[PDB]
Amino acid sequence: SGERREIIRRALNKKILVPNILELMPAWPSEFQPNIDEVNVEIDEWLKTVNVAKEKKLKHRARGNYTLLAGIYYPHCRKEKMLALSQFLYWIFFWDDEIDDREGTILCCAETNKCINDCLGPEPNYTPPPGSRGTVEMLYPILRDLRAGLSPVSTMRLKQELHDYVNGVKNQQLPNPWDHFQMRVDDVGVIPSITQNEYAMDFTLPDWIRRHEAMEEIVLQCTKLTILLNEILSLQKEFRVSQLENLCLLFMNTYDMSIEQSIHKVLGLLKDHYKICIEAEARLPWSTTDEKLNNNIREYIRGCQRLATGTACWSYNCERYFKLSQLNDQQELLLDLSR
Ligand SMILES: [Mg+2]
């Protein structure tokens, strides 16, 4: 932790201009669900019922505005689907925030995993146990509404992915950068939002295509790309609260890279994984005859891409990570690791 102090020292008050990450994924457009505004109104009415601190809810609604993120993740869904999808993102940010006490983390993950089993398992019960904490209580109806619009095929995936997320977060309690990177792969809750594209677009991907090596690769690359652009876009926010386990800082620590080189290395990894992913599209088992099947493969991988581009584009349109003033007229971001 002299280790800590030296990272803090080597990056304090550094200012780093970041190129528009969207440009690094040039073939993948960002779009906006056209009913975001009417959904936020309903999301606003709904949040009044959520047993979370009004001031915590508003900070998330104002600076996070996760309905806008859902609208970028699922820009082509119908508005009726937007409600549950948005509700889901408020849950995962409230829950993730409520964690960031070993005893209390263990207890909360156990209750959350139980909620997931109770809602998405084979003997469903959508009634929260009495005394449930607010971030667990709210999840019960949200998983129920999502389950109502998924096939059991997609349901089963969302169940595992959520469990994986929860258990991942329970298991986070200076790491080698590659160690940090890989556990974020088998943790971060991007893959639940790939599966929720099935809910949004009212289709199911057959397991046999999902297990195909190109499809798995595409999911892994878009998960990796989401993590990588998030490592850069969140460096300011986490450095200021001395969350020093950020891939950039960890490249600084392990390899004695400058922060500039470190960010630059992350930007190259992005470019690498973006081309790996594009190449995987050629190896997908596209059908010669089945249009609907091929329309299902297309929407699925569009959800994968939109998760990387959407995470970036949303971050460029909300204040969760930096103040939007920090963007120049080229969507370039001046990080300011001042404190
Ligand atoms: Mg982050």
Swiss-Prot record:
Residues involved in Mg(2+) 3 binding: N230, S234
Which GO terms are recorded in the biological process aspect for this UniProt protein?
A: isoprenoid biosynthetic process
Q: Does the keyword Cytoplasm apply?
A: no
Query: Which residues are recorded as binding Mg(2+) 2?
Result: D96
Free-text disruption phenotype from the record: Abolishes the production of koraiol.
Can you state which reaction this protein catalyses?
A: (2E,6E)-farnesyl diphosphate + H2O = trichobrasilenol + diphosphate; (2E,6E)-farnesyl diphosphate = alpha-humulene + diphosphate; (2E,6E)-farnesyl diphosphate = (-)-(E)-beta-caryophyllene + diphosphate; (2E,6E)-farnesyl diphosphate = (E)-2-epi-beta-caryophyllene + diphosphate
Q: What Gene3D superfamilies does the entry give?
A: Farnesyl Diphosphate Synthase
Among the Pfam families in the record, one is: Terpene_syn_C_2
Keywords, A to Z, come to:
Lyase, Magnesium, Metal-binding
- Coiled-coil spans are none
Q: What is its EC number?
A: 4.2.3.-, 4.2.3.104, 4.2.3.137, 4.2.3.157
Names of required cofactors: Mg(2+)
A GO MF annotation of the entry reads: (-)-E-beta-caryophyllene synthase activity
> What does the entry's cofactor note say about binding and number?
Binds 3 Mg(2+) ions per monomer.
Instruction: Please tell me which stretches of this chain the record labels as motif NSE motif.
Output: 230-238
Which residues are recorded as binding (2E,6E)-farnesyl diphosphate? R320, Y321
Where, by residue number, is the motif WxxxxxRY motif?
A: 314-321
**InterPro entries, sorted:** Isoprenoid_synthase_dom_sf, Terpene_cyclase-like_2
- Residues that bind Mg(2+) 1: D96
Comment on protein domains: The 2 conserved active-site motifs D(D/E)XX(D/E) and NSE are required for coordinating the divalent metal ions that stabilize the PPi moiety of the substrate.
Task: Give the protein family.
Answer: Belongs to the terpene synthase family.
Descriptive protein name: Terpene cyclase 6
Give the organism, scientific name: Hypocrea atroviridis (Trichoderma atroviride)
What is this organism's lineage?
Eukaryota, Fungi, Dikarya, Ascomycota, Pezizomycotina
Q: Which gene encodes it?
A: tatc6
